[PDB]
Design a protein around this ligand. Structure first.
Ligand SMILES: *[C@@H]1O[C@H](CO)[C@@H](O[C@@H]2O[C@H](CO)[C@@H](O)[C@H](O)[C@H]2NC(C)=O)[C@H](O)[C@H]1NC(C)=O
Ligand SMILES: *[C@@H]1[C@H](O)[C@@H](O)[C@H](O)[C@@H](CO)[C@H]1NC(=O)CCCC
Ligand SMILES: *[C@@H]1O[C@H](CO)[C@@H](O)[C@H](O)[C@H]1NC(C)=O
Ligand SMILES: *[C@@H]1O[C@H](CO)[C@@H](O)[C@H](O)[C@H]1NC(C)=O
Length: 494
């Protein structure tokens, strides 16, 4: 284990400084002995996923907050956690020296880091690109004879994805999402602005666009990368707005329904990539449950849709995620994009912001309490400006690269995400956790495939909160949630 080298940039907490020869890392994972629990702690005062162990007590008395595990109350199974390999992310990582690159990828993907098992891959360019390109920019190439991957894929994204997968012990799932089609498939003839596919679902424009998905998967497969899932479109509601400033492709819910039923569903199903899952929406949860009702009440669309992808930017959970699970319980919910830097009076990048850390962990807990099976960050890494970004739509990122110093900074967001991603493997099942009294804490409980327990407790208040966790199988965990802390608790149940 190597500890955090802390540095202040004058905000509420510290970043952890990494370079070619040093980065903070964990010892290999270990399980706590029966009758004991593991605790990982991070605090605004500067602790970073510090390991301690305590006893599970047979007895408890007190008028103090009790959280009772309900292990027979079973909810969703977890797909996983990760982030986006954008052009911006890959360019920033590959601008470091090779040893610094390896420590950055280990921080995310190694069991000595926080065990990411999802990578979202943009299909061609997005705002976090230094140019606009698609894979098929030759006008009216309906046969896609000039489809090809540019250097952004072959020299940046694909080589970094191979290295990430080599470092991970857990199987990693790839998720692909397009922002725009070629401009000659669009009513407005531009990568951005208000515009949808030309013509009507079933026609040559819609079939060419579906075949573009298959050509993408074929080209990644030639580079020995297979996808878990694709989204029908990134933020389809964006291409309905006049002057939308970056790459988009408009779909109404009806157009998405008909595209999936007539074109994308059948084209994928008849391909060698038929096992790739299709996720719908990939947009703000404020569009639910209306979007899910329009798409999934059509059986010709619903038979092709594995899940609903949601974005965390503009966020009420029960009315959107809850109602959607109730209508469509067998269609998984998955958080496919989250970020901060939206605050008009704050910088895009706030090095050492504890507030932005708490925003991530709060969002993940809310998501897990409303059926969401996975949580996917945006850019894996940005520069101190929050770029590059060709429209200056700069945002924050858990890792900030300083190319002039061959240095990268691990933000509180990195550790807040780690409290979940490191300790909740694929197949973990959320279970019940009931509080004995109204409290200011956020908490969630899950059970590992092997039967062991994990609880995360976030305290976004300034006040220390004493609490006990009861598991009827083993007894009582007596602990304290310090103000501006996050804890992960792990224990074997037999
Ligand atoms: C990379 O970061 C490490 C750790 O912060 C730097 O190593 C420290 O160097 C200082 C020299 O001022 C020593 O006093 C410390 O003992 C070192 N710590 C450790 C753990 O070795 C290292 O110098 C940095 N590399 C570069 C190129 O700046
Ligand atoms: C999600 C977008 O797909 C991504 O391209 C953006 O970079 C990121 C930050 O703006 C996210 N944006 C949103 O969720 C809403 C954008 C409205 C202008
Ligand atoms: C389109 O494809 C043809 C045939 O392979 C090729 O000769 C031409 O250079 C391509 N045009 C591009 C890449 O702009
Ligand atoms: C479905 O796939 C088969 C075999 O690859 C192909 O011959 C056929 O043309 C496809 N179906 C249609 C209607 O194109």
């Amino acid at each position: 284990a190597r500890p955090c080298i802390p540095k202040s940039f004058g905000y509420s907490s510290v970043v952890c400084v990494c370079n070619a020869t040093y980065c903070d890392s964990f010892d290999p994972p270990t399980f706590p002995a029966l009758g004991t629990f593991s605790r990982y702690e991070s605090t605004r005062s500067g602790r970073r996923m510090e390991l301690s162990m305590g006893p599970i007590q047979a007895n408890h008395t007190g008028t103090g907050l009790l959280l009772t595990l309900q292990p027979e109350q079973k909810f969703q199974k977890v797909k996983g956690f990760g982030g986006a390999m954008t052009d911006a992310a890959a360019l920033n990582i590959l601008a470091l020296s090779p040893p610094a690159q390896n420590l950055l990828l280990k921080s995310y993907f190694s069991e000595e880091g926080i065990g990411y098992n999802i990578i979202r891959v943009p299909m061609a360019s997005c705002d976090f690109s230094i140019r606009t390109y698609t894979y098929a920019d030759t006008p009216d190439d309906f046969q896609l004879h000039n489809f090809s991957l540019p250097e952004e894929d072959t020299k940046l994204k694909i080589p970094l994805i191979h290295r990430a997968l080599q470092l991970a012990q857990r199987p990693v799932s790839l998720l692909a999402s397009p922002w725009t089609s070629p401009t000659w498939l669009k009513t407005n003839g531009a990568v951005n602005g208000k515009g949808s596919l030309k013509g009507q679902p079933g026609d040559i424009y819609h079939q060419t666009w579906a075949r573009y998905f298959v050509k993408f998967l074929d080209a990644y497969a030639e580079h020995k990368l297979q996808f878990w899932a694709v989204t029908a479109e990134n933020e389809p509601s964006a291409g309905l707005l006049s002057g939308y400033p970056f790459q988009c492709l408009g779909f109404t819910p009806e157009h998405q329904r008909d595209f999936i039923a007539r074109d994308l569903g059948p084209t994928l199903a008849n391909s060698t990539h038929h096992n790739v899952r299709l996720l719908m929406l990939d947009d703000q949860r404020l569009l639910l449950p209306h979007w899910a009702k329009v798409v999934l009440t059509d059986p010709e669309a619903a038979k092709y849709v594995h899940g609903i992808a949601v974005h965390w930017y503009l966020d009420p959970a029960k009315a959107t995620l809850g109602e959607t699970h109730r209508l469509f319980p067998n269609t998984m919910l998955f958080a496919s994009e989250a970020c901060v830097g939206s605050k008009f009076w704050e910088q895009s990048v706030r090095l050492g912001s504890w507030d932005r850390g708490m925003q991530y962990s709060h969002s993940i807990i809310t998501n897990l309490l409303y059926h969401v099976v996975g949580w996917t960050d945006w850019n894996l890494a940005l520069n101190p400006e929050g770029g590059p970004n060709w429209v200056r739509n700069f945002v924050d990122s858990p890792i900030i690269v300083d190319i002039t110093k061959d240095t990268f900074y691990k933000q509180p967001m990195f550790y807040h995400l780690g409290h979940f991603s490191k300790f909740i493997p694929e197949g973990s099942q959320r279970v019940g956790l009931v509080a004995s009294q109204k409290n200011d804490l956020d908490a969630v409980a899950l059970m590992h495939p092997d039967g062991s327990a994990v609880v995360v407790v976030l305290n976004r208040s300034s006040k220390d909160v004493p609490l006990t966790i009861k598991d009827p199988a083993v007894g009582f965990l007596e602990t304290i949630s310090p103000g501006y802390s996050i804890h992960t608790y792990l224990w074997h149940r037999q």
